[model samples]
Target chain A: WCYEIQTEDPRSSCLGPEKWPGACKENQQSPINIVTARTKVNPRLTPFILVGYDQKQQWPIKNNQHTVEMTLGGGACIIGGDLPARYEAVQLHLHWSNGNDNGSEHSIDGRHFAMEMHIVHKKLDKFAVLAFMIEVGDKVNKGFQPLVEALPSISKPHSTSTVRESSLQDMLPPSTKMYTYFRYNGSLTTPNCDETVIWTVYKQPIKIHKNQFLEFSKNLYYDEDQKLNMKDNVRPLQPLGKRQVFKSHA
Target chain B: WCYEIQTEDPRSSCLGPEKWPGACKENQQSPINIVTARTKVNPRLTPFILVGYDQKQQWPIKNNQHTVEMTLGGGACIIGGDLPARYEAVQLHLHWSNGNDNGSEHSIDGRHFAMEMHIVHKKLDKFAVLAFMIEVGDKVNKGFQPLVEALPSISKPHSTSTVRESSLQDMLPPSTKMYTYFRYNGSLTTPNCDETVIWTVYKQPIKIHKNQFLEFSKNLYYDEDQKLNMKDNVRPLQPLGKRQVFKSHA
Candidate 1:
């Protein structure tokens, strides 16, 4: 039962209606929607660290070019240590609006956060399990100023020579107060769907300017010659069932 | 003193020769580096979850090729609430050679490890900062089995879908015994010198097999058509003077 098989379309195996006949089939037999149950669980605390920031720069400095700043914050897991485990930072990434409500990971009841921020973590001396969560914040977040400044240089696809700089750690709010935290199993939100993660989702929302969301929404494929658009990078929501949710009183 | 002016190079200011000089000239003064000190430095932690084992697929899966099954393991970050951040755990990448004394990150004493494993962590928050480190393992890590399996599929460039079911987190040592930690301002080891990072270099080393290191050294970029090769993927080390290094005694 635990053997590997080779197929032509790799994406077809787990996704689509062909290879995964049990889950991907029409009317399959299963005991509870695990995906749905996991999504419902709430978390107590989410861990994160601001790692870097980018300010806009360009070749042949042009006129009227707006500078934007973005923050690089890594999501992390909080475990018990002589020091606070939540203090040990890990990976970082982005959550942007796809111009639709169906894209966000943190949905209240049925309404989704316009964009979610996920900081993933893992315990140091325990099993290799990851904890993650989605965060929503205030609209006028000055934290994003550094990234807005460096947009021009990075906007070019695969062009790796632009030198933009910022202090990522300075972007976080001074408070370590947590909202809600949940635990569940899930997959990477990127291309590979390997479901080997212990996820934690945040209940607080951080705000951003509409224009800022628009700029992120405009992130497109760098290749001018290609017809493929880079508008939709976020993965669809997976089912969350039978998962535990926790909240931090501190 | 901060009058704005445009030029061919974005880095160039209008005061030009009077302010900053060309690279060859010795009469210019680079601006003093501004280091922002942070407070309540929270180091987050999470579980080291193992996704699966390795399974190599084809280079370019055509028609309907199945992507290889790569395992997911590593430290995941837990942020604020119950919402999980979507950091797709990827594979473990390593570096080693026939020579006995070469390691990745150079130490303050100008020393290197025999091998290094970078557990690449992409932020699931707003910006993409990779949380990585170099590990010198003892035996062939059973943890890296899944990545070794999926190597065949992703060996070729411009290949359609080699990294199908693999998550990035599967490639890590399942322990948090970091001897020391350094949070420095740095850039991506890759080109484009994007100096946007808060690099945390662990002062400890993990064990792996020499053959395993050779496997990584041999397979890396062997199939790439580019002449510059993977050697260029790494950036020269920057100056670490006056930077703070944190230690975890517990």
Candidate 2:
């Protein structure tokens, strides 16, 4: 049972501290101000090239192996590296939910999207940093094919798959038009929200089919007991006090 | 004590069926060719970027707690998704060596470099593929700065500093340069290697001062039991018959 603050209202309805009681407030305290009086800092742009794509694969759930299976999408990219280095592609995973009323691991504008995806990357040149983001949409994402193809075998938690070669470039919207982006310091959206990330939230919402969203909601797990499906996977909105949400249109 | 076939002579080293000692040859063998062949098909590329630099962080160890920490680096980047699509940056980790003989978990030419590094990334669009790689040095890697300044709390894998936004652009080498890459369907180089992935092996290698490599490798772990240090952490090389090793130069 989770409640989100209406998009129009800044206040969250969940019963807890001054802020909502959930992963967001519990792990990240609120009142994040995007524009405070501080020394001017230059916003950094990370350039990346789509190199591969993969179809979603299905995995079987333990215990009820015949009844349920998990499915998801993923791929890879070539990010600009300052150093001439060699990096390898690892696995990709996500954090999502059932509906707009209860999706997203992180909330914004007192509203949460139906889901959030994370594509994991590591530096082959040397251990460096990770780049990722949160996506919002309305349809079954065609971009998620690679992940969908891999679902049949990865039904249980901690189950993983072998690296499949793909060209994710085919999935991107053809337009190079830029969108508004929010930048901040946060944690991993998953279990250990290990606050080690510099998050960039894009203002534009992606598009996915309604059925695809349902498939994702149906497949995601909230707990090992299976009693809690990811009906509301979002962490409540935090306070944005003085932090600056950079817009790329500038 | 693992022994790799050092000789190119197939007769002297091949583990072909004819070389089976006894009952092993008669037992029904799972189709090794199919499994191995399927694993090497289509490969995918993982993407990442440099977020910030950290130089004050302490290195984590499996045994002794030492304050004699060396200067470490940190950064963040998004993984999976269409290259230009929004993604999220996740955790930061390292891959080093035990003594230099065979430190990398994945190797080419049966040769091992001093150490390799990985920055884990996940997709913001959906759960999908992950990108990673090793760090060798031929020239001074300027991208090391942002990562050096954002090291997480030592011994605390989940602990991290405030989000420091950097550019993935600052970490890249020239795109026109060619890279040596391998396409293998595999898992995360870490534990369980369960997540299937498409690995790209960079042709050019990064150069680190011999001492710097030693610094990172001094107290690395090969396994939880502490039996194997970073000496030989690479997975045994799988066979590559018809598997194509792609090169951007070609």
Candidate 3:
């Protein structure tokens, strides 16, 4: 199923998000709206310890027709904090709207940011996803230059390219700031919306220059021919349900 | 391919609007930006004569995975003004963005309305399309109630329903206002973007109630399972080639 239908199609036959088979219809689905006020402060949660994130390495990036995804090498992983076990970093991708609209999969206190970055990690069959919300600011955030520069080459769906060695640590906030986060159990944002994910969303948003943000919403296409602009990949918020959101800091 | 890629797809294999085959890349296309200041007045153009639009009958409306389309019966036709032949009305459909975004296909002076309605007419193989730009107003436009009421039933893509007998005339502006319009030679707005249509875009917009407008963008899904929101069916603005745009009034 496609995210957005672009034509006044006479056939009207394509399947959409609602038709995806599997755990998509489950109550504990993810990309939920996190209300900060209602979240409980948990002492058990602590600052995350990123392993091999400081080591520079080339990353294979591609326009996956949904978002630009960068696959991680085996060396990188995450441990410590409240995570049950060491989770190996597998891949990371982004979600954004066409322009200035809110594109973040997770909303804080009913507010949405301009974009969101999801770092997927797995320990055997289990997943622990770290979400970083993004916003457009006045100047270029140098840390993201390497990733942004590679976008043009992978502008077409399935198009791939490799970026110069860049540390994953460069893309995240300082260690102190990382401690302030919300934790919960949710499903993968996309279908089959598996509910096996342990989600951690940070409070501090990654700020980047407007030009860099524009490159994302404008430069890419959902197909190889470059007609459909690849954007608005954000999934709507699922019902928060009975799950309680927990904050790492008071 | 989808208009807005909803998920962070792992496969990234779906074809998008950019990959559609046919006359899509031709210089002459539809849904152009209508710059009123640049249009030349053509005295030859006159008030259009809409035949059988006033006769209310059951029209089959469907959520075509793109926009809502209503198929008309054989009796409806249009013949007058600058049209080359008597074009029979075949179907009518709409284009819109997700709540509050500019969704009209043909923009005027770089501005877009909240929505657009296209009435397709054909004589043998030739097509004559009439476009009506739509705006969301404070109160519900009673004229659109019948169509809006039918949306709930056809919310899922591919689902079909018939609306209560409603005259097409009720959905349009007064006859005097209809005389002021812009004319040009273009193609179908959607793929298989055939360059065989004679386009007529009226200046006066059809104002519907905001609640009624929300019914369209919110109620419909791009798939049968009801996951993808079926809005933003608008094609981006096409360049206005060497062809001159003509106005019915000075």
Which 10 residues in a row give candidate 3 chain A its minimum summed lDDT? A5-14
lDDT tens digits, residue span B113-203, model 3: 9999999998743888899999988877887999999998987888879989887877987544566899999998877899989999999
Q: What is the C-alpha lDDT of each candidate?
A: 0.36, 0.38, 0.80
Q: Higher DockQ: candidate 2 or 3? A: 2
Which 10 residues in a row give candidate 2 chain A its minimum summed lDDT?
A63-72
The true-versus-predicted C-alpha distance at residue B51 of model 3, in Å, is 76
Task: Write the residue-wise lDDT of candidate 1 on B87-179 in tens digits.
Answer: 433433444344445545344345655654544344452222323344545667664554454444444333333343432323433234432
Q: Model 3, residue A116: displacement in angstroms? A: 0.1
lDDT rank, highest first?
A: 3, 2, 1
User: Compared with the true structure, what per-residue lDDT tens digits does model 2 show for residues B121-196?
Assistant: 4543222222223455554455554444433222222232442444443343333222333333444533323433
**Residue A82 C-alpha lDDT in model 3:** 64
| CA shift of B147, model 3, Å | 76
What lDDT score is found at residue A111 in candidate 2? 52
Instruction: Give the Cα error of residue A183 in candidate 3, in Å.
Output: 0.6
Q: Write the per-residue lDDT of candidate 2 for residues A1-250, one digit (tens) a residue.
A: 2323222224433332234324544444322333423323343443333333222223222212211222212233344322234333344344455455445544455455665544444444232223222344554565655445554444444554542444333234321322234545555443333544445454445556666556554664434554444444345455554445443334
Q: What share of the true interface contacts does candidate 1 keep?
A: 0.00
| Model 2 bad stretches (over 4 Å) | A1-46, A49-89, A106-111, A122-140, A149-156, A159-167, A170-180, A190-192, A223-225, A241-243, B1-250
lDDT of 1 at A32: 15
